């Protein structure tokens, strides 16, 4: 109970700034994209139960995934290991940190031009490195794929790296990132995708999304939800004691 | 504070060699000062009662 | 050989 009281005191001191732009349905919006993220994760695990994912996630596809520190970044898939359920993805960017030094915790809806321009109008690029991304962390798979070989880029062939840079630049210019037809994997995949689309339609039906400062209005709500979840997790009491023979 | 550790090599599981290492287990633990099941046995004491 | 080359080109 000492830790519970400490966490209660910590959450009591959290500052809030309520603006009419994001005061109507902010909590419902938070519940909605948390449900959307859960459904996407469930789809991701259920999509790795069949070897057909190799043809879907073949080498060279551009995919957006969330790092362990919640930052969404783009990369190119190179190899897929089904035994470990892990993939090695060639990244070429930096985490999209907030100006004050925070990560963006919202959901990136594909094929949403206005939403994308409001929340992610700008991005940054840097050098490339190899990363072992768990398959769970994958957020969205883009239809556009890098057809050029990656071993040449590893060997740093001049023409290969120049073409890779040109493709990266023309991808970073236009930000559409439409869906890759992915329902063909199976019936469970189709059902989870239908649930995801239903949740997305419901979250789009809300009028609290029009504010361009959603990155500056849901951070307190997100922190409150995280603290409440942590407290509820710590709330376990498996002991069934007597205190009657004392 | 040292002991042998025996190593195996092969699918049949035959011991191939041994090395002297450190053991992570007080040192002289008997029935008078320890509650661990790995403490020493006093065979001069009654084993049933 | 051509066979070994093709095999290596198909895998790692």
């Amino acid at each position: 109970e000492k830790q519970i009281k400490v966490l209660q005191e910590e959450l009591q001191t959290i500052e809030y700034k309520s603006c009419e732009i994001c005061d109507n349905d902010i909590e419902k919006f938070l519940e909605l994209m948390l449900a959307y993220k859960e459904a996407t994760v469930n789809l991701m695990q259920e999509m790795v139960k069949s070897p057909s994912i190799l043809h879907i996630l073949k080498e060279g596809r551009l995919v957006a995934f969330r790092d362990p520190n919640d930052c969404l970044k783009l990369g190119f898939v190179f190899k897929v290991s089904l035994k470990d359920a892990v993939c090695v993805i060639m990244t070429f960017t930096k985490p999209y940190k907030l100006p004050n030094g925070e990560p963006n915790h919202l959901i990136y809806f594909p094929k949403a031009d206005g939403y994308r321009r409001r929340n992610f109008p700008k991005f940054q690029k840097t050098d490339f490195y190899m990363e072992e991304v768990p398959v769970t962390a994958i957020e969205v798979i883009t239809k556009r794929k890098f057809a050029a070989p990656l071993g040449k880029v590893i060997k740093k062939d001049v023409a290969a790296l120049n073409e890779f840079n040109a493709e990266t630049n023309n991808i970073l210019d236009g930000k559409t990132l439409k869906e890759a037809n992915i329902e063909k994997q199976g019936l469970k995949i189709h059902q989870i995708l239908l649930d995801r689309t239903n949740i997305r339609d419901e979250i789009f039906k809300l009028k609290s999304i029009k504010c361009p400062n959603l990155s500056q209005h849901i951070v307190p709500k997100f922190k409150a939800h995280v603290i409440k979840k942590k407290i509820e997790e710590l709330y376990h009491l498996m002991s069934d004691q007597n205190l009657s023979l004392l | 504070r040292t002991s042998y550790q025996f190593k195996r090599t092969g699918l049949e599981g035959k011991i191939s060699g041994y090395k002297e290492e450190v053991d992570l287990k007080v040192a002289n633990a008997n029935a008078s000062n320890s509650l661990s099941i790995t403490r020493s046995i006093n065979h001069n004491q009654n084993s049933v009662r | 050989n051509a066979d070994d080359a093709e095999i290596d080109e198909l895998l790692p």
Binding site: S52, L187, H190 | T9, G10, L11, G13 | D3, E6
Partner: protein, 366 residues
């Protein structure tokens, strides 16, 4: 009227659904597009799987995956709405087992057999025979627990009808998977004599002939099968891969009884199969077998077996575990053995060989 057309369509039993009067379906859908059975039939016609050609009729009046979003959605809606329709259940079951959906089709086949029992108690066996065939195929594919029940069902079907080659080929498949080939040769020879045109029938006939005795024309039997495919669907691609694997297997089998042309030819066939499939685990398995046995190479066989096991397998797992354990690397060997045990796809071979449990125990001990 709507009622008369609905009753006529529900009562018009078809030996095969592809022989239905497609212009009649067009007329009925134009008249009553709202009927759930009408939209089910329209989705069946629109499906690439059927023999119908909607575009020609109207003019006269690469990834892995086969199911269609519209057809699945429409059939799900109709099965949620109706709960009682012989034709709807039959179409849904056909789409299920054609889309390689056996487990998901079991409750729907149970509902269909309940409806056919309702009709029997309220009697053309043309639909009952088709539903029994569907259930027997589901038992044969999904389940070695229901194999005996499916075999008994096949025996009853053959005794009562003796006019369907599908039951004969299913019994032949059951006999092949149980290593009971003696009846398989007779059944396959009889079927081939009945119709020496089915490419798959010739494939199994040559397979059974090659497994013992005659190997001369067993290789050439698959030639008319591989050459006559000319297919572009996923099913066609995997059937070509299976035929190539079968011909390579029987080819090395005949080569079993200095010479290296046979090994080279089997290698080329397996390489072509792997190229046209890119996920065909038995191809990698056979390549690793050849590399380990004849070419006396280590790294190539290890890589082929590793790919085969990652995609899928007792022999590949044993080879990889033996390779790790001799380094020694007990963590990786423990991982491979634990994956093999937890897979539950090799429980038959784990009742006689005890190396996986010993490997896991040794890795814990280390």
């Amino acid at each position: 009227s709507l009622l008369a057309w609905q009753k006529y369509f529900e009562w018009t039993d078809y030996e095969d659904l592809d022989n239905m009067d497609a212009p009649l379906i067009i007329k009925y859908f134009k008249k009553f597009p709202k009927d759930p059975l009408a939209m089910i039939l329209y989705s069946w016609l629109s499906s690439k799987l059927s023999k119908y050609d909607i575009k020609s009729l109207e003019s006269a009046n690469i990834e892995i995956g086969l199911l269609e979003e519209e057809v699945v959605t429409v059939l799900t809606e109709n099965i949620v709405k109706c709960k009682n329709n012989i034709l709807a259940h039959r179409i849904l079951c056909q789409y299920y087992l054609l889309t390689k959906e056996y487990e998901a089709a079991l409750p729907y086949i149970k509902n269909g057999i309940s409806l056919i029992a309702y009709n029997i108690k309220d009697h053309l066996p043309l639909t009952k025979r088709e539903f029994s065939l569907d259930l027997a195929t589901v038992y044969t594919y999904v389940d070695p627990k229901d194999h005996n029940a499916a075999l008994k069902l096949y025996d009853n079907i053959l005794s009562g009808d003796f006019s369907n080659i599908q039951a004969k080929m299913g019994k032949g498949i059951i006999f092949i998977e149980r290593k009971n080939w003696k009846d398989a040769m007779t059944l396959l020879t009889q079927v081939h004599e009945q119709s020496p045109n089915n490419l798959e029938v010739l494939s199994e006939l040559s397979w059974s002939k090659a497994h013992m005795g005659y190997m001369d024309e067993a290789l050439a039997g698959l030639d008319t099968v591989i050459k006559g495919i000319k297919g572009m669907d996923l099913r066609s691609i995997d059937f070509r891969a299976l035929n190539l694997w079968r011909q390579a297997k029987v080819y090395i089998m005949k080569h079993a009884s200095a010479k290296q042309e046979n090994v080279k030819c089997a290698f080329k066939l397996l390489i072509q199969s792997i190229k046209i499939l890119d996920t065909f685990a038995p191809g990698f398995s056979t390549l690793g077998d050849i590399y380990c046995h004849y070419y006396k190479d280590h790294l190539r066989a290890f890589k082929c077996y590793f790919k085969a096991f990652d995609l899928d397998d007792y022999t590949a797992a044993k080879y990889i575990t033996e390779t790790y354990a001799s380094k020694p690397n007990w963590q990786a060997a423990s991982s491979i053995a634990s994956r093999l045990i937890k897979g539950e796809k090799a429980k038959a071979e784990l009742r006689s060989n005890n190396w996986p449990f010993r490997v896991v125990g040794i890795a814990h001990l280390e």
